[PDB]
Design a protein around this ligand. Structure first.
Ligand SMILES: CCCCCCCCCCCCCCCCCC(=O)OC[C@H](COP(=O)([O-])OCC(O)COP(=O)([O-])OC[C@@H](COC(=O)CCCCCCCCCCCCCCCCC)OC(=O)CCCCCCCCCCCCCCCCC)OC(=O)CCCCCCCCCCCCCCCCC
Ligand SMILES: CCCCCCCC/C=C/CCCCCCCC(=O)O[C@H](COC(=O)CCCCCCCCCCCCCCC)COP(=O)([O-])O[C@@H]1[C@H](O)[C@H](O)[C@@H](O)[C@H](O)[C@H]1O
Ligand SMILES: CCCCCCCCCCCCCCCC(=O)OC[C@H](COP(=O)(O)OCCN)OC(=O)CCCCCCCCCCCCCCC
Ligand SMILES: CCCCCCCCCCCCCCCC(=O)OC[C@H](COP(=O)(O)OCCN)OC(=O)CCCCCCCCCCCCCCC
Ligand code: HEM
Ligand code: HEM
Ligand code: HEM
Ligand SMILES: COc1c(O)c(C)c(C/C=C(\C)CC/C=C(\C)CC/C=C(/C)CC/C=C(\C)CC/C=C(\C)CCC=C(C)C)c(O)c1OC
Ligand SMILES: C/C=C(C)/C=C/C=C/C(OC)[C@@H](C)[C@H](OC)[C@@H](C)CCc1oc2c(O)c(OC)cc(OC)c2c(=O)c1C
Ligand SMILES: CCCCCCCCCCCO[C@@H]1O[C@H](CO)[C@@H](O[C@H]2O[C@H](CO)[C@@H](O)[C@H](O)[C@H]2O)[C@H](O)[C@H]1O
Lengths: 385, 93, 62, 55, 246, 125
């Protein structure tokens, strides 16, 4: 047989990237996964090169990043790639997840695939938070303060967990040094989780836009999808480049260009954009404990979809009601984000509480009710007795 | 090697699909085809069709949310202006 | 229908007067993509490699 | 296009020629861009400001 | 939130450096430095800017050396261990007016003049904001506004009450290049200078972006073409079904 | 949701002249908006098959219908990838959009349900 198939190392490459049978009809929405691997690589490479010039001590962290920006040859390119890349990593992840939601990718036999994906999402959010704290700007200090405090809501031992996470009385040197060490570690755990994600993907293969079997017409990954992936890889790089070179700070917060101050929390404090919908959810609950529980539940509820989707067909392509409510969900999510960016004021507080309800109602009420109705509609529209 | 669990996808030669018979396919080398320039005049009016069926599913939920957003924002602006400081004290606490 | 009667591909097929028309275009595209990629990769590699050279603030003339 | 068949004759361009052309491109392209860029910003550059200074 | 608390939205001025193909105006940078030295430097530090970065940007190697030497910096102790000073060199960072935070607050009614090295990037509005603030002090605050003692009114600052009084006045600086030193002209200059302080890579960054975007755009258009070619056989493929007899 | 359950609800509606005249027209409009018929598919071709019930059912399907399902599915993927719909004259007509796999599915679900019942039968003395 060909060497690519006989060699122990190359056969892995062959089965995953060359001869892997792909359903002939997958569309550009199936290009997000490769884009995520590319994002992971960009974050790791740029972070290691910057680590070479970074000091984690709380007294030097902010200046060491300014040093990367001013004195390191091409340093600003590395930092801007890393920062803007993190944002692009989230934009693509949301699209990858939304694609799964729309096409019923979370369904059997891909439940394990979906569950591992949820874990990766949690780890990615934690990784970005740890990195954000390393800059040690104003948003870094308060973000670290607020987020480590999320654990104080745990009854009895909560405050002990926080003092342990901090390594002291408050967010200080011990805190930033351990957050940098952890920021360096997690990306590699994410890499291992991605391999487990690809392993689950390999046993059943990708799904397709029709939601039915792809077994009757497959085409090799090599050539077709390798070059098709190339198309979105360049488009992705072009757009990332426009931000990195022409508008590098548009997706960030001006307060992070101010060294962290333990005695003053800016009135302008706003979480990173990709965290806004979750932030809004927490803010909508006027209780400390319930606020943090509901926010975490907003992520874990994604695990419920394989069970609440009662439909007999995979995906929303041929489902009028499901398509409509899917978009209600998407735009409701964007609203949650817009609410997160707003002040805790009158119209906003109530809108956030209603949007929060709609968010949970989608998975727990709308999908099971609507999918059941659609099941019945499909039946009575053709059975003549 | 070690026994592998049954799945819903095999490999070339045993994909796991049903036995096919009666279907005949035809194709022509990309080399023998008209170089990329014909995707117009014949493939232009045909396009844009796969969004004429979908835009309503996107637009209506979008409209509902944009309106809801605009309304709440304009109301907040009123509440914090001179004219609305009376209503503000009412709806606030 | 008889399998010997090949369906119509006229709308796709080029009126062959220039045999290597599609080939020359494809190979030029592939060749140009290979060129710009190699230059891009070289520039990317140099960008990262040069970040490790002496920083602007350490080139003090004692 | 017969222009292609004169240099490469129905065969694809080989890596060596691709690599060689890339080194050439890099230099040419950079000068072309720097020239246009500096010209587009004539008057604002330090080169221009230094000319109006004498010390 | 009330307009006063939010602060007046700064309008968009036509900065010569706005635009993808535009570099900073280096003459304005040069002038901006003078305004900083003669006005701002009395209360504002510029800690992240090293003398050497001025060379080839706004001043000559000689001019910067003279400027650095006007300041004394701590040197290495002598043969006997006693401390000693030294004139400044290009490797040094522009010195600040105050020795520590406490001394800075004492000289400003308890307020702390922030360092201006990043001020342009550390505020929404960027150049538009900084400029508007400097040229937006009304001779008298709007009717009804109870301004605290030692404070000043400026509509562009959140809350309207700012601890920095107007400091730019017509002809308070004599521009080396003969330019009329009006307040709006001086504001336009320091702001341009401060943008460079915060973004020294600006001109070079946009030049690299131009090359990067051209190469990537081409690669993008090219890949589309290559993909369509590699897929032509599949896209135009045709099927026929002849039901098998039993 | 099992097909036995969909049938229970669906038949109850179909028998009652009250609901039958109210719902069917809605259902008919839903089916046309779905659009699967424009791709040359029958609803039963759309049922997710990666489960034992559907495998048992597809296994029991007579040859001729099996080869037909195969052609429809392949034809649908090719049309989908070309981002077109089939020429109107090739669309599946409502008369053809018959639940051909349904009887095999219902039979398999009943057989399955009985095994589950018998494996868990209690005994009273
Ligand atoms: C302040 C925030 C700013 C926003 C930031 C934006 C976020 C950036 C992060 C990620 C960006 C890179 C990711 C690219 C892919 C994302 C879109 C996607 O997958 O849509 C697939 C989706 C699937 O298409 P398909 O059915 O497989 O394609 C059939 C093609 O005709 C099959 O045709 P084909 O293969 O022969 O050729 C296909 C096509 C392929 O073109 C591509 O490269 C991929 C398709 C992307 C189209 C537009 C994406 C817009 C992204 C923003 O090539 C073309 O000729 C189309 C070019 C059209 C315009 C492209 C944009 C030019 C920008 C100038 C710079 O394409 C769409 O329907 C596009 C929807 C656009 C709305 C996206 C909403 C999210 C925002
Ligand atoms: C890991 C993956 C990273 C991918 C990131 C993609 C997002 C797009 C932004 C890329 C930014 C880096 C490049 C850059 O800024 O150079 C810019 C050119 O960038 C490009 O052409 C980018 C397109 C390449 C895409 C990738 C091709 C394939 C991937 C290779 C992987 C192996 C300017 O290049 P340079 O000539 O000035 O040189 C450089 C420049 O002048 C330096 O300042 C100088 O020090 C040096 O000597 C010189 O060669
Ligand atoms: C670094 C590579 C070290 C290779 C050892 C060199 C040697 O000595 O390799 C000796 C082997 C001989 O093996 P043989 O197949 O000829 O068998 C002998 C006769 N039956 O040649 C190879 O494996 C060549 C393979 C080269 C490719 C290496 C990397 C492949 C890239 C993808 C990696 C996929 C694995 C992912 C795992 C998580
Ligand atoms: C954590 C989970 C929450 C997710 C986060 C929210 C997601 C936000 C953005 C992701 C967009 C997903 C699009 C649907 C994916 C899919 O698959 O769309 C499939 C559909 C149609 O396909 P079709 O085959 O039926 O066409 C018929 C072929 N037979 O494409 C579309 O209609 C086109 C896209 C519509 C535009 C959506 C815009 C929403 C973006 C908001 C912009 C934010 C700005 C601030
Ligand atoms: C998927 C992985 C990663 C993500 C999502 C990520 C994300 C981030 C984020 C959001 C920041 C702050 C950006 C800013 O400055 O505003 C950051 C900073 C940083 N990251 Fe990462 N990071 C990742 C991997 C890595 C790795 C492996 C390293 C290797 C050491 C690393 C090193 C750093 C350093 C040194 C900083 C500080 C410099 C800076 O602010 O850009 N990162 N990261
Ligand atoms: C770093 C993150 C990730 C990487 C590198 C990754 C990569 C991939 C790849 C290569 C594919 C195949 C191509 C595609 O369908 O796009 C895939 C499929 C899939 N992924 Fe991910 N993924 C990531 C995160 C996630 C997350 C966060 C989820 C969900 C919460 C998820 C859910 C899925 C599912 C369900 C599929 C199958 C889609 C289908 O075939 O219909 N992935 N992923
Ligand atoms: C044209 C020269 C100057 C420039 C460019 C300038 C610029 C600025 C800027 C941008 C701020 C920050 C305002 C904000 O938080 O948004 C500020 C604050 C301040 N400046 Fe200046 N300044 C100048 C001269 C002066 C002088 C000479 C003094 C000392 C008499 C002074 C004292 C202060 C003080 C006390 C603050 C604190 C404001 C507060 O916290 O309320 N500045 N200046
Ligand atoms: C069936 O479905 C599939 C499918 O199976 C596959 C495989 C793909 C193709 C996509 C992929 C395989 C994506 C895979 C990506 C990854 C596994 C990324 C893993 C991440 C990493 C970060 C790798 C680790 C990297 C390093 C150790 C290098 C970094 C450090 C360096 C270079 C050292 C620097 C230091 C010095 C001193 C020079 C598809 O697109 C697809 O659907 C269409
Ligand atoms: C060693 C690792 C540790 C201790 C922690 C890791 C795990 C934590 C998370 O998830 C993994 C966590 C990021 C959370 O996830 C639920 C996100 C949605 C956070 C959402 C979030 O962000 C904020 C933020 O960014 C801010 O910046 C200025 C400020 C903030 O208040 C004003 C917030 C905030 O109020 C919330 C809820
Ligand atoms: C990841 C970093 C990027 C590195 C650079 C990217 C890769 C560039 C590769 C450039 C040239 O690679 C080149 O490809 C062409 C095919 O396209 C090969 O050509 C081969 O196939 C073509 C096409 O059937 C035949 O006409 C030709 O006679 C044959 O030799 C050529 O021998 C190889 O040398």
């Amino acid at each position: 047989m060909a060497f690519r198939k006989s060699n122990v190392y190359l056969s892995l490459v062959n089965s995953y990237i060359i001869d892997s049978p792909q359903p002939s009809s997958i569309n550009y929405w199936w290009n997000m996964g490769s884009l995520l691997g590319l994002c992971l690589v960009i974050q790791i490479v740029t972070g290691i090169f910057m680590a070479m010039h970074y000091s984690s001590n709380i007294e030097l962290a902010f200046s060491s990043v300014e040093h990367i920006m001013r004195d390191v040859h091409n340093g600003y390119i590395l930092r801007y790639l890393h920062a803007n890349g993190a944002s692009f990593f989230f934009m693509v992840m949301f699209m990858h997840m939304a694609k799964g939601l729309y096409y019923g990718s979370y369904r059997s036999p891909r439940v394990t695939l979906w569950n591992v994906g949820v874990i990766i999402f949690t780890l990615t959010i934690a990784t970005a938070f740890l990195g954000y704290c390393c800059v040690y700007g104003q948003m870094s200090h308060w973000g670290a303060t607020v987020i480590t405090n999320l654990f104080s809501a745990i009854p009895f031992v909560g405050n002990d967990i926080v003092s342990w996470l901090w390594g002291g009385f408050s967010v200080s040197n011990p805190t930033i040094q351990r957050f940098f060490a952890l920021h360096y570690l997690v990306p590699f755990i994410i890499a291992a989780m991605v391999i487990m994600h690809l392993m689950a993907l390999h046993i059943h293969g990708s799904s397709n836009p029709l939601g039915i079997t792809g077994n009757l017409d497959r085409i090799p990954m090599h050539s077709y999808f390798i070059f098709k992936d190339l198309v979105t890889v360049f488009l992705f790089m072009l757009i990332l480049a426009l931000f990195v070179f022409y508008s590098p700070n548009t997706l960030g917060h001006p307060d992070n260009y101010i060294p962290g101050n333990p005695l003053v929390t800016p009135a302008s404090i706003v979480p990173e954009w990709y965290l806004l919908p979750f932030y809004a959810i927490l803010r909508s609950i006027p209780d400390k404990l319930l606020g943090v529980i509901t926010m975490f539940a907003a992520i874990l509820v994604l695990l419920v979809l394989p069970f609440t989707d009662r439909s007999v067909v995979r995906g929303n392509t041929f489902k009028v009601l499901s398509k409509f409510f899917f978009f209600i969900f998407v735009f409701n999510f964007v609203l949650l984000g817009q609410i997160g960016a707003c002040h805790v004021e009158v119209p906003y507080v109530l809108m956030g509480q209603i949007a929060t309800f709609i968010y949970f109602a989608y998975f727990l009420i709308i999908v099971p009710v609507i999918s059941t109705i659609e099941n019945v509609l499909f039946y009575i529209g053709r059975v003549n007795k | 090697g070690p026994p592998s669990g049954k799945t819903y996808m095999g490999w070339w030669g045993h994909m796991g699909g049903p036995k096919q018979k009666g279907i005949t396919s035809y194709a022509v080398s990309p080399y023998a085809q008209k170089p990329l320039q014909g995707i117009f005049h014949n493939a232009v009016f045909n396009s844009f069709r796969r969004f004429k069926s979908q835009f309503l599913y996107v637009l209506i939920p979008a409209g509902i949310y944009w309106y809801w957003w605009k309304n709440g924002n304009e109301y907040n602006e009123f509440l914090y202006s001179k004219a609305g400081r009376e209503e503000l004290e009412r709806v606030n606490v | 229908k008889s399998t010997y009667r090949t369906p119509n591909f006229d709308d796709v097929l080029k009126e062959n007067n220039d045999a290597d028309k599609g080939r020359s275009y494809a190979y030029f595209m592939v060749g140009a993509m290979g060129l710009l990629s190699s230059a891009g990769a070289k520039s990317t590699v140099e960008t990262f490699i040069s970040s490790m050279t002496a920083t602007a603030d350490v080139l003090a003339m004692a | 296009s017969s222009l292609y068949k004169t240099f490469f004759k129905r065969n694809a361009v080989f890596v060596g020629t691709i690599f060689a052309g890339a080194f050439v491109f890099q230099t040419v392209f950079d000068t072309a861009i720097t020239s246009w860029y500096e010209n587009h910003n004539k008057g604002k550059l330090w080169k221009d400001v230094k000319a109006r200074i004498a010390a | 939130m009330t307009a006063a608390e939010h602060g007046l939205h700064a309008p968009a001025y036509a900065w010569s450096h706005n635009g993808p193909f535009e570099t900073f105006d280096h003459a304005s940078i040069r002038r901006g430095y003078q305004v900083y030295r003669e006005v701002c430097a009395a209360c504002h530090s510029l800690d992240r800017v090293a003398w050497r970065t001025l060379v080839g940007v706004s001043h000559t190697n000689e001019e910067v050396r003279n400027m650095a030497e006007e300041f004394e910096y701590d040197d290495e102790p002598d043969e006997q261990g006693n401390p000693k000073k030294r004139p400044g060199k290009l490797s040094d960072y522009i010195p600040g007016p105050y020795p520590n935070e406490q001394a800075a607050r004492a000289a400003n009614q308890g307020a702390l003049p922030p360092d201006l090295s990043l001020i342009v990037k550390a505020r929404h509005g960027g150049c538009d904001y900084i400029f508007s603030l400097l040229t937006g002090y009304p001779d008298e605050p709007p009717a009804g506004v109870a301004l605290p003692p030692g404070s000043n009114y400026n509509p562009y600052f959140p809350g309207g009450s700012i601890a920095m009084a107007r400091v730019l006045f017509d002809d308070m600086v004599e521009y080396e290049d003969g330019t009329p030193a009006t307040t709006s002209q001086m504001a336009k200059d320091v702001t341009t200078f401060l943008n460079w302080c915060a973004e020294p890579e600006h001109d070079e960054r946009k030049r690299l972006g131009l090359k990067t975007v051209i190469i990537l755009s081409s690669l993008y258009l090219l890949s589309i073409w290559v993909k369509k070619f590699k897929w032509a056989g599949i896209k135009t493929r045709k099927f026929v079904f002849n039901p098998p007899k039993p | 949701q099992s097909f036995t359950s969909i049938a229970r609800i669906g038949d109850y509606i179909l028998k009652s002249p009250v609901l039958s005249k109210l719902c069917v027209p809605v259902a008919n409009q839903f089916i046309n908006l779905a659009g699967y018929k424009k791709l040359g598919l029958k609803f039963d071709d759309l049922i997710a098959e990666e489960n034992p019930i559907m495998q048992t059912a597809l296994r029991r399907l007579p040859e001729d219908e099996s080869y037909a399902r195969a052609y429809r599915i392949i034809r649908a993927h090719q049309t989908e990838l070309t981002h077109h719909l089939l020429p109107r004259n090739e669309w599946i007509k409502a008369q053809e959009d018959v639940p051909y796999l349904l009887p095999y599915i219902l039979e398999a679900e009943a057989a399955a349900k009985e095994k589950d019942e018998l494996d868990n039968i209690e005994v009273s003395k």
